[PDB]
């Protein structure tokens, strides 16, 4: 019955995962991404145009990276975080799969 101590790198990955889930997964973050996919951001910038698509890509890339860090780690706290990341990714992918078709 083995359990390994998390390092800073892994404790960081867990911290960032729950953060980007709270702040970068809000409803208007997803709605914004969908409307950007329909071509209506609107593309003009009077400042703070925000490029929701780009943010959402970064959110995905981030989650996928922290998930990689925590995937095989023998700590249960790491595996719970890996689950939360995997879940978040599936929340996003279900929202945009098959959109616009």
């Amino acid at each position: 019955k083995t359990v390994d101590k998390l390092n800073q790198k892994q404790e960081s990955a867990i911290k960032k995962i729950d953060n980007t889930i709270k702040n970068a997964l809000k409803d208007h973050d997803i709605i914004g991404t969908l409307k950007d996919m329909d071509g209506k951001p609107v593309p003009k910038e009077n400042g703070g145009y925000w490029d929701a698509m780009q943010e959402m890509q970064n959110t995905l890339r981030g989650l996928r990276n922290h998930a990689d860090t925590l995937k095989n780690v023998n700590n249960p706290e790491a595996q719970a975080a890996y689950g939360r990341a995997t879940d978040a990714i599936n929340k996003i992918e279900s929202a945009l799969k098959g959109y616009g078709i």
Partner: protein, 314 residues
Amino acid sequence: GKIFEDNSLTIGHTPLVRLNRIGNGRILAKVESRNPSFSVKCRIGANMIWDAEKRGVLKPGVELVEPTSGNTGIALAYVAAARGYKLTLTMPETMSIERRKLLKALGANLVLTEGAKGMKGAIQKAEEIVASNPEKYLLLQQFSNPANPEIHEKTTGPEIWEDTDGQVDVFIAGVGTGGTLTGVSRYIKGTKGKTDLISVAVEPTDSPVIAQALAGEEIKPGPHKIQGIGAGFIPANLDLKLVDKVIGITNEEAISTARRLMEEEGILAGISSGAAVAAALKLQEDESFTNKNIVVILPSSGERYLSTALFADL
């Protein structure tokens, strides 16, 4: 001559046009916006419903239901109007007013699902509606239903064969459902026995799942701007055994090339049309393809997208 009994029978026989100022003159663009609802999807809006009649499941009292935020909604809407069916479409509430108006004028019943739930929200509601009265409602299922590639094999493919007189070398199509690519290739490779043909799928670089699939990599979809393709998964109506190759295209490449189609060729084109033609352009950089005849699909007209970023600079 010909009198069509209703507008669904007018599908097809879209023109094949040489691109003169784009590429070297061997790019032949099939303009699929010349269709009753003006998209390549007109073809499956009709035969998905035709097929449903023939199988007998669609009969008095039975209404049609599909989740879609795209052209498939427009193609099902006009066919249900012409053949006298009750239609219900589910899409997220992100859909613009103007697009709603277009579907209502065609007599579709619209159910707007919760925006943050996205496209799964619509697919869910669609299943719940069919679940409420399985006898009354009929789900068309554009990604799985075999009627979709079938017309492309019965019509889209045959036309490409005939208009080129068997001399098509490369066939290029963006993949939304995969039906076009699958059915056309299935006609040219299978039925006319030309296995030489290079079938090239086009997807966005930001959701490159066909490239991931052909490399045995994990499937990692993302948001992109090319409307009509980039489903974010491998749809059942995409047969990979027919796919020789896949070219990923950036948002900017598709938009810039769409604009070139309208300004340099006189062809109204939406983003996905620029995408497919840009793939043909990338293929001509490889000097093995420079002398080959390339038929590329042009799914929609830019006019449909007139409020979008496709038209930016004044």
